[model samples]
Target chain A: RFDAEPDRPALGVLELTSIARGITVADAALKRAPSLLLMSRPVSSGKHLLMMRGQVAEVEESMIAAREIAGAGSGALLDELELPYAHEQLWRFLDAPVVADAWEESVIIVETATVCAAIDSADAALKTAPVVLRDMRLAIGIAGKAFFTLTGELADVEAAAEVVRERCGARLLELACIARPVDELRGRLFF
Target chain B: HAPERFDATPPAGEPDRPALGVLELTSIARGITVADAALKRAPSLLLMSRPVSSGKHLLMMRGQVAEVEESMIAAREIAGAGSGALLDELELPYAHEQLWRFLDAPVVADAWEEESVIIVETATVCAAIDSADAALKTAPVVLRDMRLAIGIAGKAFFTLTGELADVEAAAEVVRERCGARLLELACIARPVDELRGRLFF
Candidate 1:
């Protein structure tokens, strides 16, 4: 639902070692391009992340400026990414959705080591399944690894898991499915 | 406000070469058992004894070289006797100045705008502490924060500030001490004021 703005066709993400320098990078990126800052916060993994979206050229320029500033100031840049033509649904996972209710159908989980990998796997899974996103825990309280849940028919969930496995490949950490997850498990899964 | 103190600074007359020892194990239960054993064996300052990330526990202490050796030997026996609980360990006969500063409560100091900063990340809390010890022993540097895996599971990192040469030396030592456990490291000369804003824990 958050991906309503289709004019922005590209996404940029940067991870830095110093939250302080991360702020400076964010400022530089904003000043360098006409981009929408989606997120800039200190993640529980003890690093800072900034995400932005804009036209492909604008996003590229923003990324370049952010990278330059991070490199010069404390050199805290840990990772940087630019995804032109990013999948619309990918933003939903990063937003940390609030699952309204439990799905009566089967549920599947896919995990990865990095947030970027998790986003990639999630995009593939959503494209493959007529599923509802249950939750996503990315690079926090889990050794900087990420995991996301999806609910759908058993066959659809299975197909989604297959897509995730193929897309994530080496980055894939774990994948599991519950054909008939009990209510207690579903409650625990969301919270 | 003055920061709360943990253990009183070791008596000034204590031996200069206060031995430093660390024990890392997979199980928190076994870690506490070994820590208790080590403490009972010698008069040592238990600098840090707590659970780390990945369901691991770490115990660090300082004392006479012989006492530290004896204590660590007992800890090693207990951790080794277990079913593969021991992960890693270290014993330093001559504890470095930076080690004491890291363990002691931080004192407010003026920001050194001219100095450079280096940040190092490790896969586990134990590795981070071990690397900090090694880095400080090898170079003239001051630690910022040795954030163990508390909110983040199975990961830890630390930051240091010093001259460019010293920071460079420390980074090499940290990389070597952490080895495969080292996740990432970065150094910046003449860090901007923005870089100091959220550097503290």
Candidate 2:
């Protein structure tokens, strides 16, 4: 399931509690390595997210550096991750977002506690299931949580759900499996 | 805070000037419950009642000062009976004249195209309007537009434009007054040309 670009080997992300503090820590990660800062913005629940990209080794170094500085305060360090080789579908989902053929027979919607978990679990879900990725959002409009929907046969949707549930573990906030959904309410699944 | 659904003005054939009651709750079910309670308790006109972002509910009403005050007190008790689902509530007896007009027709055309802009975001639905009321009064900035969590998860945000100094001052006022609830505060002196359409919608 490792399907990132050959040149860009890793993506490191830090989900911190304070927006102002996240900015300061993000600058440290950049100085530690020649990592490319991909994304930095305020997310849901009034939290902050900082993403960096580089080779696998450099990204791991950067991720660990920020993790140490985030401190041990309650919820100060919400989530941190370094995706060495993410799946290809994760890229497509972010690039294209919502698709027209998302209203299939069955769907599995997964909500994660942090954007870091979504990155790790989305790849695992896609690798095992024959389900099609319908909709995916990384804490954009969902109040700091990341969610994705997979549409396909009920059995495939369930398999994807199984993978996501087990891999995401405590990070998995909620998961729903809707089989044979009505046609009229199709639009509600994405928006 | 919805720009299109301006509940600041009274209903048709109603008094031109009346008190405003606003109540926001964490649960959509509670929103409907409190809205019904306010309407049933007083002679208030329901201005806006609907589900907002972050899976919360919003209700606004217009009526006489005493009626609106009573309705607000009743709704607060009803919504906060046990578990404290109320996010924010306000009863503006007689709001500023310009604030009323700003809510009636949000986002002056010229302000959006201004050189400077400041955006203040809050975690609660009513915080945007409550903070905006003071931001407009204390600063020389013009309120551009505001959104109540519809697409922004459950947070609310408002945009204003003026001279860089004025925008900075307004942002300071919002930060100081909005207190711990303020989420994001951003003011740009020379905004990019492409933000005109993206600012409001």
Candidate 3:
């Protein structure tokens, strides 16, 4: 359902502390520029972030407009991102909702204190390992912290986590890998 | 099945506790230890003990003013023993009626007349909880909402409605309690219907 097409690329991201202000930014950006709105909603950390895709120029214009709109809301803006050449593979990971899905083999969980670090880690993890994303929780619960769960062969998951750790650096809060995780453990890790 | 509502009323035959005390710290594990020590030091009812936003732990309890004071001392000793753990603490002699809504049901109440609305925002969920406790104890007010760290990361905010004077008093206490963590505050006299329905936090 969240597949990315060959055309219509480049991703832009904006994070705001207030949901209402984020809506204002989203509206202004859409009016001033042309882009595909991927997601726009309140996340776990009581912050709202918007994701979109378009040509580099269009995405840059949207981000600039968004920043101006977000700035009016007195310290509402938290973070912003411009991924002009974002990998199309990220759509699948970003599109799926956080849910408990049964899986075998090893599982890796990477958690970060910020949404940007978590997003960056997602791209790096996918590039590092041939793993299936079980869920991606962004500041939804756990105090604005972001984390994602992936499953793959033990070696692949470990290698993916290492890359994520390097990319996340000090922002990395927690990282764990469970080899042959039991069914009971899988149920508890959701969300 | 419907979730059971928490009863905020003090237990029948239970001795009156005229004070409310809160202790917020960094580590969840250390905070739990502090809560245990405080409970053991005095005969107080534990209200809340959980991890809040910004990876902090909030512990609250109710008891006699003396017992509540004693509890806070014990909590401070333990919370302070840890490195960089203590965040904030509060002790209110007279908790407000409106603040009990958090322990019971936080549903918005039906209002007959427009009242003043006061909002207090803090950097951490624990501070928000503490400020709300102090504010309710200080003024004759009712809670509109108590938003803990959920969407706003480590930040928390709450709204109260009451007479202008009461709301103003509550705001002062909240500001003092929140101290440097206080991000923003507003007192809207007779908020309109349109504004009341909106999310202030």
Candidate 4:
């Protein structure tokens, strides 16, 4: 139901070093507002990462409570993100809809140290440029580091990459954009 | 568990001749900084210096115990700031000879099969290595494989093949030493051949 609405809902994420403390902040977020928990679990970085989605105001309000608890020494917060109006694909990216049979004119890749930033950059980039969300990896094997691929016209790809740089700051690990990639390397570049 | 490079100074050449030290950091940039600083501080040879999974950096060095120990001190001091804190560390003045071999790469076990097998999973990369070293000395078993924090979610594990009692005892030592760090421990009395592929690679 949250995904079906024409008006996309807000997204909130919280990262903390302690799993035990993470549970506390997650509890606070759900208790603070009418938000839906998307995911919560311990990452390879030995930190607990939590994600929530709901109405714009509800998600934003929930983040306030999470941020407060993660602010002090109790939570040892690493990174947090709040997207008031996230792109629809941002929600579909988690399920990995499908990859196009052919490549777009260009593609851009963004790697982040934390899962929260990965989602944040993806949402920001998708909302900024007319790029397609190719794929978004969330710390499954690459040890808590998350990465996403966006494909579109070279101009659109570059614009999307720029948004990631502006939003991620120090959390960004890498940003690479390729135009008219090699025929043999097309499949691997997006992977 | 492959060597960082083929031609590198062969980690612990001559079986524990050079002490081993490992420093894992949260920040990738900080790890590069510490890696350079460690070399400048001591004559330790870097066995491995690169980013592992989970957005973490791993640094492995080998040299005389004192030199490695010296570098470790400087390395930690540099990584102590901001988000580049030390996640885990290991400083061994005398690592077991057999342990060094396994660290370089997994042993083929040319022919493996005892009464049973013991699988030990640990929370940190170094803990698995450390446990294997102690376990090797405690029992006669084959270190089938040692998977560091590459794809296993920044966690590590190792498997041993030998007599059921011996494998169990070795795992016990691993369990006792690992304490809360121990993720799981299983002793299979007679593992099927199909299970081999599932566990090793």
Q: In lDDT terms, which candidate is top?
A: 4
Interface RMSD of each: 12.8, 8.8, 8.5, 9.1
Judged by DockQ cut-offs, is candidate 4 incorrect, acceptable, medium or high?
A: incorrect
**Residue-wise C-alpha lDDT for candidate 2, range A89-180, written one tens digit per residue:** 66655422353443437767676768889877877888887777666667655566676767777898898889888989998866667665
Total backbone collisions, model 4: 4
TM-score of chain B of 3: 0.76
Q: Which ten contiguous residues of candidate 3 chain A have the minimum total lDDT?
A: A182-191
Selected candidate, larger lDDT, 1 vs 4? 4
Ranking by TM-score, best first?
Answer: 4, 2, 3, 1
TM-score of chain B of each: 0.79, 0.81, 0.76, 0.83
lDDT for A121 (candidate 1): 72
For candidate 2, the chain B TM-score comes to: 0.81
lDDT of 2 by residue, B1-201 (tens): 234334455457746536777787765435545665675677676666544557465777666898888888779887896786788887788654455544332343443543688888898866777788777787787776766777667677778788888888788788877789898888788877777636543
Give lDDT: candidate 4, residue B8: 22
- Measured against the native two-chain assembly using Cα atoms, what DockQ does each of the candidate structures obtain, in the order listed? 0.03, 0.06, 0.10, 0.14
Q: How far out, in Å, is residue B45 in model 3?
A: 2.5
Q: Candidate 4: misplaced stretches above 4 Å?
A: A1-8, A72-75, A95-104, B1-201
TM-score between candidate 4 and the true structure: 0.53
Span of 10 residues, lowest total lDDT, candidate 3 chain B: B1-10
Residue-pair clashes, model 2? 2
lDDT of 4 by residue, A96-181 (tens): 22333455467776778788788888888988889888766666545667777788888988988888999899989766666655
Report the lDDT tens digits of candidate 1 across residue range A98-137. 4334444777766565676777677778877787776776
Clash-forming residue pairs, model 2? A44-A143, A44-A144
RMSD of each: 14.4, 11.4, 9.6, 11.0
